[PDB]
UniProtKB/TrEMBL annotation, chain B:
Disulfide bonds, paired cysteine numbers: 11-14, 11-27
Keyword set, alphabetical order: Metal-binding, Ribonucleoprotein, Ribosomal protein, Zinc
Protein family membership: Belongs to the bacterial ribosomal protein bL36 family.
GO terms for MF: structural constituent of ribosome
PROSITE patterns linked: RIBOSOMAL_L36
Listed InterPro entries: Ribosomal_bL36, Ribosomal_bL36_sp
Keyword Ribosomal protein included in the entry's annotation: yes
Organism: Escherichia coli (strain UMEA 3162-1)
HAMAP family recorded: Ribosomal_bL36
Gene: rpmJ
Protein name: Large ribosomal subunit protein bL36
Sections of the chain in a coiled coil: none
Key word Transmembrane helix present: no
Domain of life where this protein originates: Bacteria
Residues bound to Zn(2+): 11, 14, 27, 33
Length: 5, 38, 142, 176, 209
RNA sequence: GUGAAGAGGGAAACAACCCAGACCGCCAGCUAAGGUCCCAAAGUCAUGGUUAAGUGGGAAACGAUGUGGGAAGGCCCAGAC
RNA sequence: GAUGUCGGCUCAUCACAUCCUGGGGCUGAAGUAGGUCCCAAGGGUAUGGCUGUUCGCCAUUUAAAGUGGUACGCGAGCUGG
RNA sequence: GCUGAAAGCAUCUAAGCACGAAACUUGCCCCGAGAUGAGUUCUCCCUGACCCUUUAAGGGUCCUGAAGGAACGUUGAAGAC
């Protein structure tokens, strides 16, 4: 699911 | 009583005395003088 | 041939009575720990409890050098968060005079099942009299 | 160790007993007793009490001086009673003595009652001052301190309880 | 000071001529028969063992009946103990009634609380309920977080969580004694007390004073 | 130089530090570093001192009739402090 | 060859360089009320308006509306502005 | 703060005493002998035959089945079970 920018 | 690392004679009536392993100053004439080392 | 080893069901055990009046806590403890572990016996075996039974009297009269009679602090944690408890030497003597000897000796004995078994031979009393006269302990001077 | 060197005289009518380290001084004003420390050696080989440090003790010399001072005051106590005079300063400050107990009024909403030790006596020439008499310099000194502790002398006006010979450094209140 | 064992008969209202209504819990205190006296020389503490009420003779075990027979007393509901101070003494078989509280202004009441069973955190610990709307997903009245990540890496002992609630010994202190009726063996105490009607109850003089 | 590519003993645990390079076996001995009151193998060892702070078992400028030792100086039984 | 963010919600726990309560020394401390320093962590330690906000400003309270650590505590507990 | 020397004085301290806070140990409430260091007190119950050799805290047959508990049933302002 999750995003890390 | 004002606590500071440096304890000194600020006047003639002052005297240094050790009571419980801590240096402190007792002054008979002016209570402002008295200090404790801490 | 194979080195001799002590047998827990053939070891001979004898009883001793020790007066703690005026004795220094640490140096008395070492002798008790030495005796409870059987290091003084010629048949010493690390994996066998070869020590003797020790009776300690007047546990409240032990002496401690220096200012640690009031500065010696005993720490134990209850298990609850923030459950750190304090007890000075004077408080321990006033509350439970017998725990000072056992705590000192317990920390000097080995750790593990054998160490606990050796501790079980130590029997401390706060007073001058004991109820183990049936064992006819010998007077042992340290 | 100048104080230790000076001997203490025991005049007629004063009985002194030495039993190891404990000493018992007796006189017309009562009796007193204390246990000296092992580091101080006291002898009664003459009509004067002589003191010296027991061998092997570093503090013996300094400790010896204390014994001379303590016994010297004690022999005075048994011969004469130490007296402490306190003065009450205030608009409505009064003192009364019921015997072993002293009742004081110092502006409190409640009465102040103080009981004396067995070895002390008090009496009131006037309600504005009180006199303490006793045999032992220690307890009599302590009793006065507790008496003075209820209301220490007020700086800007001096009101309270003070020793009769006390000097109070009055300070002027801040102007404006 | 020695107390007594009673039964929570119920709750009642007491009117006063001044117009004030006092809610009073009615406690019936039958004769309290002392069954044993505890002594220092033999037991290490001074106390009295007492029994109250009566129970069917067909269900008194001779290990228990023999205990009653030793003191010459009829078997009661149960056995309770009270510590003795320096000034009080008692004899086995002595019967104590409600007049003991005639000179007592305040009493201490203890008993088993009503059992709520498995209670949630909201009911048990007054935990704040989370939002019932605004996107909440299956977490309306759940406890929530129970820790602080890796550093502790565990749940601390005594953490408040759902569990058994009630059905435990509870003591209510400083209850005023409204009236003592020694002709019917009743004690009236202002306010409510732990336990349901008919439950065993222990009444002692107010220790708080 | 060591690790990397190096085991063993020591530094409580701790590739790189100290000691020292494991061909295999032994229930023999002597040693290195480091240690010898107990956990835990070996000194509750023999002398002469220091420390009272558990310093030793963390930290500076600076402060203090702490206490031990050493070399000088002023005043002083013409009476000092 | 995966340790999911800010803030909110819920639940917290510790430190003391202490905001309130407690005990004191000084004060250029008359009193009332303060200033400063020392000891003290047992308990307690706001609701709202605006903004996603923490924060902040403002309104009105309170004995006080403490400062920090805990993956700027807490998404296999919620939310997703 | 008391007395008081080291230091003729002074000095709350080195010997010896006194007071001193919501901190500390108790006091109040709850759990609690798995406290294996397994505690104490008061009652209750069981007072038979034999047999074998690996002859010992030994095994087995017959007789016996106590105190009490459990199970089942009617159920509880006790309870997920
Ligand atoms: Mg080990
Ligand atoms: Mg229920
Ligand atoms: Mg969903
Ligand atoms: Mg829902
Ligand atoms: Mg861990
Ligand atoms: Mg490589
Ligand atoms: Mg991975
Ligand atoms: Mg407390
Ligand atoms: Mg806000
Ligand atoms: Mg609006
Ligand atoms: Mg975070
Ligand atoms: Mg989040
Ligand atoms: Mg998580
Ligand atoms: Mg969005
Ligand atoms: Zn000065």
């Amino acid at each position: 699911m999750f995003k890390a920018f | 009583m004002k606590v500071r690392a440096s304890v000194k004679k600020l006047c003639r009536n002052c005297k240094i005395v050790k009571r419980d392993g801590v240096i402190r100053v007792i002054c008979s004439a002016e209570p402002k003088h008295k200090q404790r080392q801490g | 041939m194979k080195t001799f080893t002590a047998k827990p069901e053939t070891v001979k055990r004898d009883w001793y009575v020790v007066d703690a009046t005026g004795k220094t806590l640490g140096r008395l403890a070492t002798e008790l720990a030495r005796r409870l572990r059987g290091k003084h016996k010629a048949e010493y075996t690390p994996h066998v409890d070869t020590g003797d039974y020790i009776i300690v009297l007047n546990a409240d009269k032990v002496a401690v050098t220096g200012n640690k009679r009031t500065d010696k602090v005993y720490y134990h944690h209850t298990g609850h968060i923030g459950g750190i408890k304090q007890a000075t030497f004077e408080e321990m003597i006033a509350r439970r005079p017998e725990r000072v000897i056992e705590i000192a000796v317990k920390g000097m004995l080995p750790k593990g099942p054998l160490g606990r078994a050796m501790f079980r031979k130590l029997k401390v009393y706060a007073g001058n009299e004991h109820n183990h006269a049936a064992q006819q302990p010998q007077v042992l001077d340290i | 160790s100048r104080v230790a060197k000076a001997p203490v005289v025991v005049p007629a009518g004063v009985d002194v007993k030495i039993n190891g380290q404990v000493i018992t001084i007796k006189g017309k004003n009562g009796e007193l007793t204390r246990t000296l420390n092992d580091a101080v050696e006291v002898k009664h080989a003459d009509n004067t009490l002589t003191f010296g440090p027991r061998d092997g003790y570093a503090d013996g010399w300094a400790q010896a001086g204390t014994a001379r001072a303590l016994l010297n005051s004690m022999v005075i106590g048994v011969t004469e009673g130490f007296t402490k005079k306190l003065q009450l300063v205030g608009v409505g400050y009064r003192a009364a003595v019921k015997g072993n107990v002293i009742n004081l009024s110092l502006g409190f909403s409640h009465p102040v009652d103080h009981q004396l030790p067995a070895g002390i006596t008090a009496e009131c020439p006037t309600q504005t001052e009180i006199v303490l008499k006793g045999a032992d310099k220690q307890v009599i000194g302590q009793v006065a301190a507790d008496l003075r502790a209820y209301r220490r002398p007020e700086p800007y006006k001096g009101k309270g309880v003070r020793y009769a010979d006390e000097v109070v450094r009055t300070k002027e209140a801040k102007k404006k | 000071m020695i107390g007594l064992v009673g039964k929570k008969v119920g709750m009642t209202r007491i009117f006063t001529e001044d117009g004030v209504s006092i809610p009073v819990t009615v406690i019936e205190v039958e004769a309290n028969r002392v069954t044993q006296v505890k002594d220092l020389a033999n037991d290490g503490y001074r106390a009295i063992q007492v029994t109250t009420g009566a129970k069917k003779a067909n269900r008194v075990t001779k290990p228990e009946a023999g205990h009653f027979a030793k003191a010459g007393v009829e078997a009661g509901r149960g056995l309770w103990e009270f510590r003795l101070a320096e000034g009080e003494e008692f004899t086995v078989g002595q019967s104590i009634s409600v007049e003991l509280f005639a000179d007592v202004k305040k009493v201490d009441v203890t008993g088993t609380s009503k059992g709520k069973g498995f209670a949630g955190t909201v009911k048990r610990w007054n935990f704040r309920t989370q939002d019932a709307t605004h996107g909440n997903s299956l977490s309306h009245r759940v406890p929530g977080s129970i820790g602080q990540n890796q550093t502790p890496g565990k749940v601390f002992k005594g953490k408040k969580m759902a569990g058994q609630m009630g059905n435990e010994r509870v003591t209510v202190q400083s209850l005023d004694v409204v009236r003592v009726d020694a002709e019917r063996n009743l004690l009236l105490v202002k306010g409510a007390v732990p336990g349901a009607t008919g439950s065993d109850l222990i009444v002692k003089p107010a220790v708080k004073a």
